[PDB]
């Protein structure tokens, strides 16, 4: 499947793509303000992300530190990035049927619209202004506004016993961004695709 990656936010971002033990495609690469990337996703692909990283600094060999979506300091991401990351998620031909969602449950750090650009289903948004808004507690130094569970490592936040209910803070990222995942437990925002569609993760949708 193809995605094109578009930055449309007025700051320079370093794309990232993996599914957590493998990038997909080259990885990540520097978008500046209005670059597109497309990368090509192999069928089948179970559990991919894909998300940007801000102030990133690399060197020669493709090895440097981001302040938000850090993937073990690498350009080319193999693994997935340290929170807070606004996170576009997607499984593809799975019985006949492409998944995907926008989820907050690893924070947020940048605006994002994940829609298909083949036909037969719609896209999804978080466009609010979360960093923002960010209560106090959870504000990232680096930028971003970070997720309950990577900040305080409870098992009500982190859902850890396969239990829990919503809280104070993934209300909030729920009021601002309603078609996102704001907890594990959230009721599924998930789109369902046919299988095989192609796709646009566009970041700064509304900038």
Not at 49 to 69: L, P, V
Not at 160 to 170: H, L, M, R
Request: net charge positive; hydrophobic share 30%.
């Amino acid at each position: 499947a193809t995605f094109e990656i578009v930055n449309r936010c007025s700051y320079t971002v370093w794309a990232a793509a993996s599914k957590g033990d493998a990038a997909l495609d080259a990885g990540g690469r520097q978008l500046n303000s209005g670059e597109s990337w497309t990368i090509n996703v192999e069928p089948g692909t179970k559990g991919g992300k894909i998300w940007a990283r801000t102030d990133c600094y690399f060197d020669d060999s493709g090895s440097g530190i981001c302040k938000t979506g850090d993937c073990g300091g690498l350009l080319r991401c193999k693994r997935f990035g340290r929170p807070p990351t606004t996170l576009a998620e997607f499984s593809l031909n799975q019985y006949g049927k492409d998944y995907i969602d926008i989820s907050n449950i690893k924070g947020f750090n940048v605006p994002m619209d994940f829609s298909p650009t083949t036909r037969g289903c719609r896209g999804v948004r978080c466009a609010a202004d979360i960093v923002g808004q960010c209560p106090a507690k959870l504000k990232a130094p680096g930028g971003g506004c970070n997720d309950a569970c990577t900040v305080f490592q409870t098992s009500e936040y982190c859902c850890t016993t396969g239990k829990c209910g919503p809280t104070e803070y993934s209300r909030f990222f729920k009021r601002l961004c309603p078609d996102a995942f704001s907890y594990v437990l959230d009721k599924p925002t998930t789109v369902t695709c046919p299988g095989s569609s192609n796709y646009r993760v566009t970041f700064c949708p509304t900038a």
